[PDB]
Design brief:
The longest helix is centred in the N-terminal third of the chain and has 12 residues. Helices cover 36% and strands 0% of the residues. The chain is mostly helical. Forms a ternary complex with IGFR1 and ITGAV:ITGB3. Forms a ternary complex with IGFR1 and ITGA6:ITGB4. Interacts with SH2D3C isoform 2. Forms a ternary complex with IGFBP3 and ALS. Belongs to the insulin family. It is found in: Secreted. This is Insulin-like growth factor 1.
């Protein structure tokens, strides 16, 4: 019921399109720093579309 490896990249490619995507969720400066991201959210666990789309890079212009 989840998305891993190749299936996850295909999903991010389709949802993010031109914008591209990243895997590690941003953290705050001088924050805590073991890193978590989409694998944890969507592969080890199931996530919904609105979580997944938070890993799209910003819109260009």
């Amino acid at each position: 019921e989840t998305l891993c490896g190749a299936e996850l990249v295909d999903a991010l490619q389709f949802v993010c399109g031109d914008r591209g995507f990243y895997f590690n969720k941003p953290t705050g400066y001088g924050s805590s720093s073991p890193q978590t991201g989409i694998v944890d959210e969507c592969c080890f666990r199931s996530c919904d579309l609105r979580r997944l789309e938070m890993y799209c890079a910003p819109l260009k212009p």
